[PDB]
From a paper:
The spike glycoprotein is the most prominent surface‐exposed entity of severe acute respiratory syndrome coronavirus 2 (SARS‐CoV‐2) and possesses the vital molecular machinery required for recognition and fusion with host membranes. The spike protein mutations that cause increased virulence and immune evasion are predominantly found in the receptor‐binding domain (RBD), which is specifically responsible for host recognition via interaction with human angiotensin‐converting enzyme 2 (ACE2). Here, we present two synthetic single‐domain antibodies (sybodies), designated Sb#15 and Sb#68, that recognize non‐overlapping epitopes on the RBD. Cryogenic electron microscopy (cryo‐EM) revealed that Sb#15 binds within the ACE2 interface, whereas Sb#68 engages the adjacent conserved cryptic epitope.
Three cryo‐EM datasets were collected, allowing a glimpse of the spike protein either simultaneously bound to both sybodies, or associated to Sb#15 or Sb#68 alone. The highest resolution was obtained for the spike protein in complex with both sybodies, whereas structures with the individual sybodies were determined based on fewer particles and mainly served to unambiguously assign the binding epitopes of Sb#15 and Sb#68. Analysis of the spike/Sb#15/Sb#68 particles after 3D classification revealed that the spike protein adopts two distinct conformations. The first conformation (30% of particles) has a three‐fold symmetry, with three RBDs in the up conformation (3up) and two sybodies bound to each of the RBDs, confirming that Sb#15 and Sb#68 bind simultaneously. Structure of S‐2P with both Sb#15 and Sb#68 bound to each RBD adopting a symmetrical 3up conformation. Although the global resolution of the spike protein in complex with both sybodies is around 3 Å, the local resolution of the RBDs with bound sybodies was only in the range of 6–7 Å, presumably due to conformational flexibility. Therefore, we did not build a full model for Sb#15, but instead fitted a homology model into the density. Sb#15 binds to the top of the RBD. Its binding epitope roughly consists of two regions (residues 444–448 and 491–507) and thereby strongly overlaps with the ACE2 binding site. When added together, the sybodies synergized to stabilize two states: a predominant 3up state and the asymmetric 1up/1up‐out/1down state, thereby shifting the conformational equilibrium of the spike toward RBD conformations competent for ACE2 binding.
Residue numbers in the entry:
A (entry chain C): 348 to 644
B (entry chain Y): 1 to 124
C (entry chain E): 26 to 66, 79 to 141, 153 to 174, 186 to 243, 261 to 347
D (entry chain D): 1 to 52, 52A, 53 to 82, 82A, 82B, 82C, 83 to 110
C-alpha cells in the first residue's frame, strides 16, 4: 500500500503465528510496545487491525510513542502508551528496480500535526503564504506529494524498512486473531494434572463407555463435580476419576507387649503404596512398611 | 530489574586476542537482546555486536565483520564477546546492554537499555 | 390481533455443562409458561425487541429470507443485516438505508441502497418445517439457540417438549430496539418475548432435557421447585413468604406557626 | 531556523567540471544526513548522492557512479560536490535536501550542459 492510502483493514477470525516471524532471519527493528514479545503468542488482545507501508529507514528511531519528527508528524503517528508491535525489516533485495522505485509516492507537507492512527488522503497542495495558487504550480504552491528515491546503490540506512503495525486497541469486542497454542500428547490412567481447552484439574483420565452429542464441551455429575472433558484432537472421549487419598491408621498391640505395628492405608489399591508416599525420601525404617511378603488388601 | 556487571578488559598488543564477558542478574527470562556498545575518544558511542537470546542470530558492524564474534552462555547467564585480530583503532570504552522489548538493529543510544558500568580496552 | 398460547415450549440448555440424571435449578432469561405469542401472515410490520425474543416459524416453502436489525433503520445509527439465500447466508453490520416498503421472477432486490461505513462481515453455511430460534442481545453479544423438527398442521403451535441447543455467538456490541422481517404464497411465524424466570430442569441419563417446571406458574410446580422433585408426596410443604407493601407514605410534623418579625426587616423604609 | 541556499552554478560544455556548494544554517552536519536532488526539464525529481550523518559512507545514483564526488565541510557548515565527466543528460536544477525536524529545500541553482 501507499502512505496516502494505508487502509485500516479488518482481518478477522484467523490465527497468526509469530515464531515464523521470529526465525525469519531478516528483521531489523522488531519493536513491541506495551507487552513483551516473549508473551505475545500465548496471550492475545482484541482489535487486531493491521497496517502496511514500505517506509524509508533513516528515521525509524523517530517512530515511537511520545516522539515527533517527520513520519510521526506527516505520515503515521502513534498514540501514548501504545499496545502493539511495529515491525521493520530489510527491503533491499525485492523492492529495488533501476532508476529508483517511483511507486511509493509520499506526502511531505500537511497544515496541522497528524492525529494518532489517521489515514490521511488528499489531492490539494500545501498552503504556506497569502497568495493563492491558481492551479499552475508557482513560487509558494509547495506540492507535498513527493517521491521516495530508492536506488540499489543506497546504504542500509537509506534503503527502506518495511513497516507493519499490529496495533491492539481496546474496544467492547472479543478478540478475533490470536497466536497459536502449543500442545503435547496425552497420557492415560495416571494421577496427572492436565491443561485442556479452558479447564485444568487433578485426576485420572480413563477410557470412557458413554457417548457425546457434538455440542457438549465438558461434563459434570450430581453435586457439581466434573466427569468428562473433550480432547479436541484425537476424537475419543475420556473421563476423570480423582486420584486416591485417605487417612492412615496404625494398629498396635501395646508398647509393653511388643514393638511391632501394622499400618492401615485405607480405601486404596494395595500396590502403589511406595508410589503414594515418598518411600525414596523417608527413612529405611519406613521403607520396609511399603512392600514385603505380608502385603494384604 | 536487570543489573549488568562486566569485566575482562585490559591491555594487549595489536594482533592479539581478548575476551569480554557481561554477567546478567535479575529478570533473566525477560531479557531478549544483548548489544555491545563502543565509544571511541572523540567519537559518538556506536554499535558493534548483537545477539538475540531466543533465536541465536548474530549481527555485526562492517568494521568488525570477520574479526569479532559474540556468544551466549545460558548456564552462567553471561554473554561473551571474543576479539580476534585486533587493530589499534579499537581503543575505546566498551559497554554491554540488555534489552527487554525485543531486538533492534542497528544499536542506538536513545532507546531504553540496561547499561553496564563500562570497561576499558586499550590496544596499540 | 390473532394471539396464540405457548404450551410448555421454549426451554433451552442454560450452559455448555453436561449433567446426567439430576434435577438442576437455574435463573436465566426463560419463557414463562402459557404466555401469549403473536401470529401474522403481505404482512411485515415493525416490532420492538424487549430484552429477548423467542422466535418460531412454520413453513412449506422458503418464503422468509432475512431480517433488518437496528435502532432507527436510517443513515444515522448503525444497523445489522442477516440475509439467508439458496446457497449462502450473509452476516454484516454497516450503516444502512432501509426502504419504506422492503421486500425481496427468480431474483428481486430492492431492500437497501447504502454501502458506507461497514465494520463487520461474516459468511457461514445455512406446512412441513418447524424452525424455532432464540434472538437475544446480552452484554454486547448475540446468541442463537435453535431446534428443527417436522410437523404437519396449519393452525397453531404443535404439542411436545424440545430443548434448544446454542449455535452462534456474534461480536456486534451495538444497541437494539426494533427489528423487522423480510419476505419474498403465504407463511406463518411466531414471536415470543423472554422474561427473567427461575426454572427446574430435568436431565436424563444422556443429558437431554426431557421435562421442566416453572417456579412461578402454579404452586404445585413451585413446590416441585423447592422440593427438587417431579413427583410430590402427600403432605404440607412450606415454600416461601409474603409481605404487605405500603402505599401512601404520609408526612406529619408539628405546627410551624411562630411568625417572627422578619417583616420589619423586609418591609420598612429605613434599615 | 533551518535554511539551505545553493550557489556556484553556471553554464558549462560537455566534458567540463564545476564545484558546487550547499550552505547550511541552524543545525550541525555531524548529526544529520544529506541528500541531493535534481529536476530535469520534463522529468521528475530524482536523487543524486548522499552522505551519512557519521561521514563514513558515501553513495551515488546508478547513472552517476564513477564520475561524481560528494563531500562535506564540518567547520564551514556547507556540503560540497566535486562534479566531473559531463554528458548532456545532466542538465537539471540542483537542490540539496535534509531532514531537520521538518524538510527544508533550498531555492536551487541552474546548471546547463550544452
Ligand atoms: C501389657 O499390659 C497389659 C495391660 O496393661 C497386660 O494385659 C499384658 O499382659 C502386658 N504384657 C506383658 C508382656 O506383660
Ligand atoms: C489393583 O491393581 C492391580 C494392578 O494392576 C490390579 O490387577 C487390580 O485389579 C486392582 N484392584 C482393584 C480393586 O482396583
Ligand atoms: C392472551 O390474549 C387473549 C386476548 O388478548 C386473552 O384472552 C388471554 O387471556 C391472554 N392470555 C393470557 C395468559 O393472559
Ligand atoms: C463511520 O463511523 C464512525 C463510527 O461512529 C464515525 O466515527 C465516522 O465518522 C463515520 N464515517 C463516515 C464517513 O460516516
Ligand atoms: C446505545 O444506547 C444506550 C441508550 O441510548 C447508550 O447507553 C449506549 O451507550 C448506546 N451504545 C452505543 C454503542 O451507541
Ligand atoms: C412586604 O409587603 C408586601 C406588600 O404588602 C407583601 O407582598 C410582601 O409579602 C411583604 N414581605 C414579606 C416578607 O412578608
Amino acid at each position: 500500500a501507499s502512505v496516502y492510502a494505508w487502509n485500516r483493514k479488518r482481518i478477522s477470525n484467523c490465527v497468526a503465528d509469530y515464531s515464523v516471524l521470529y526465525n525469519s532471519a531478516s528483521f531489523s527493528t522488531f519493536k513491541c510496545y506495551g507487552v513483551s514479545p516473549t508473551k505475545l503468542n500465548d496471550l492475545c488482545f482484541t482489535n487486531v487491525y493491521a497496517d502496511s507501508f514500505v517506509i524509508r529507514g533513516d528515521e525509524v528511531r523517530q517512530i515511537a510513542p511520545g516522539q515527533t519528527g517527520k513520519i510521526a508528524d506527516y505520515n503515521y503517528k502513534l498514540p501514548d502508551d501504545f499496545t502493539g508491535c511495529v515491525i521493520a525489516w530489510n527491503s533491499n533485495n525485492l523492492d529495488s528496480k533501476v532508476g529508483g522505485n517511483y511507486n511509493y509516492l509520499y506526502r511531505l507537507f500537511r497544515k496541522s500535526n497528524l492525529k494518532p492512527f489517521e489515514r490521511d488522503i488528499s489531492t490539494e497542495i500545501y498552503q504556506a503564504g497569502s497568495t493563492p495558487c491558481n492551479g499552475v504550480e508557482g513560487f509558494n504552491c509547495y506540492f507535498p506529494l513527493q517521491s521516495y528515491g530508492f536506488q540499489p546503490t543506497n546504504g542500509v540506512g537509506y534503503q527502506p524498512y518495511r513497516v507493519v503495525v499490529l496495533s491492539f486497541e481496546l474496544l467492547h469486542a472479543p478478540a478475533t486473531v490470536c497466536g497459536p497454542k502449543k500442545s503435547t500428547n496425552l497420557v492415560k490412567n495416571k494421577c496427572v494434572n492436565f491443561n485442556f481447552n479452558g479447564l485444568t484439574g487433578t485426576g485420572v483420565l480413563t477410557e470412557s463407555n458413554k457417548k457425546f452429542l457434538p455440542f457438549q464441551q465438558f461434563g459434570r455429575d450430581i453435586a457439581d463435580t466434573t466427569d468428562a472433558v473433550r480432547d479436541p484432537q484425537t476424537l475419543e472421549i475420556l473421563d476423570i476419576t480423582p486420584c486416591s487419598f485417605g487417612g492412615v491408621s496404625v494398629i498396635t498391640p501395646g508398647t509393653n507387649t511388643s514393638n511391632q505395628v501394622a499400618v492401615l492405608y485405607q480405601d486404596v489399591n494395595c500396590t502403589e503404596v511406595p508410589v503414594a508416599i515418598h518411600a525414596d525420601q523417608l527413612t529405611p525404617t519406613w521403607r520396609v512398611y511399603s512392600t514385603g511378603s505380608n502385603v494384604f488388601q | 530489574q536487570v543489573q549488568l556487571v562486566e569485566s575482562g578488559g585490559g591491555s594487549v598488543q595489536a594482533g592479539g586476542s581478548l575476551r569480554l564477558s557481561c554477567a546478567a542478574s535479575g529478570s533473566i527470562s525477560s531479557i531478549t537482546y544483548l548489544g555491545w556498545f563502543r565509544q571511541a575518544p572523540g567519537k559518538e558511542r556506536e554499535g558493534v555486536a548483537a545477539l538475540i537470546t531466543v533465536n541465536g542470530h548474530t549481527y555485526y558492524a562492517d568494521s568488525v565483520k570477520g574479526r569479532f564474534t559474540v556468544s551466549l552462555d545460558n548456564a552462567k547467564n553471561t554473554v561473551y564477546l571474543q576479539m580476534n585480530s585486533l587493530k589499534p583503532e579499537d581503543t575505546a570504552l566498551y559497554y554491554c546492554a540488555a534489552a527487554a522489548w525485543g531486538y533492534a538493529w542497528p544499536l542506538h543510544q536513545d532507546d531504553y537499555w540496561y547499561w553496564g558500568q563500562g570497561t576499558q580496552v586499550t590496544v596499540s | 390481533p390473532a394471539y396464540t398460547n405457548s404450551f410448555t415450549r421454549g426451554v433451552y440448555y442454560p450452559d455448555k455443562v453436561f449433567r446426567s440424571s439430576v434435577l438442576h435449578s437455574t435463573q436465566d432469561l426463560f419463557l414463562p409458561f402459557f404466555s401469549n405469542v403473536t401470529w401474522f401472515h403481505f404482512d411485515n410490520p415493525v416490532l420492538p425487541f424487549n430484552d429477548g425474543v423467542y422466535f418460531a416459524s412454520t413453513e412449506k416453502s422458503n418464503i422468509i429470507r432475512g431480517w433488518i436489525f437496528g435502532t432507527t433503520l436510517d443513515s444515522k445509527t448503525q444497523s445489522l443485516l442477516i440475509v439467508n439465500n439458496a446457497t449462502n447466508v450473509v452476516i454484516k453490520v454497516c450503516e444502512f438505508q432501509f426502504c419504506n416498503d422492503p421486500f425481496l421472477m427468480e431474483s428481486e432486490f430492492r431492500v437497501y441502497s447504502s454501502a458506507n461505513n461497514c465494520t463487520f462481515e461474516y459468511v457461514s453455511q445455512p406446512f412441513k418445517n418447524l424452525r424455532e430460534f432464540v434472538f437475544k442481545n446480552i452484554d454486547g453479544y448475540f446468541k442463537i439457540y435453535s431446534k428443527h423438527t417436522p410437523i404437519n398442521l396449519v393452525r397453531d403451535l404443535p404439542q411436545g417438549f424440545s430443548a434448544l441447543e446454542p449455535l452462534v455467538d456474534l461480536p456486534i456490541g451495538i444497541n437494539i430496539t426494533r427489528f423487522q422481517t423480510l419476505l419474498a404464497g403465504a407463511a406463518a411465524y411466531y414471536v415470543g418475548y423472554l422474561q427473567p424466570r427461575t426454572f427446574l430442569l430435568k436431565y436424563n441419563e444422556n443429558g437431554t432435557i426431557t421435562d421442566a417446571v416453572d417456579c412461578a406458574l402454579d404452586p404445585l410446580s413451585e413446590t416441585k421447585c423447592t422440593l427438587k422433585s417431579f413427583t410430590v408426596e402427600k403432605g404440607i410443604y412450606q415454600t416461601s413468604n409474603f409481605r404487605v407493601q405500603p402505599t401512601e407514605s404520609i408526612v406529619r410534623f408539628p405546627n410551624i406557626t411562630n411568625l417572627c418579625p422578619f417583616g420589619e426587616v423586609f418591609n420598612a423604609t429605613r434599615f | 531556523q533551518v535554511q539551505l541556499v545553493e550557489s556556484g552554478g553556471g553554464l558549462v560544455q560537455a566534458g567540463g567540471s564545476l564545484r558546487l556548494s550547499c550552505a547550511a544554517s541552524g543545525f550541525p552536519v555531524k548529526n544529520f544526513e544529506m541528500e541531493w536532488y535534481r529536476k530535469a526539464p520534463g522529468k521528475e525529481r530524482e536523487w543524486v548522492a548522499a552522505i551519512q550523518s557519521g561521514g563514513v559512507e558515501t553513495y551515488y545514483a546508478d547513472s552517476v557512479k564513477g564520475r561524481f564526488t560528494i563531500s562535506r565541510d564540518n567547520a564551514k557548515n556547507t556540503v560540497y560536490l566535486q562534479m566531473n565527466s559531463l554528458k548532456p543528460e545532466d542538465t537539471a536544477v540542483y537542490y540539496c535536501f535534509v531532514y531537520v525536524g521538518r524538510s527544508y529545500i533550498g531555492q536551487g541553482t541552474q546548471v546547463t550542459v550544452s
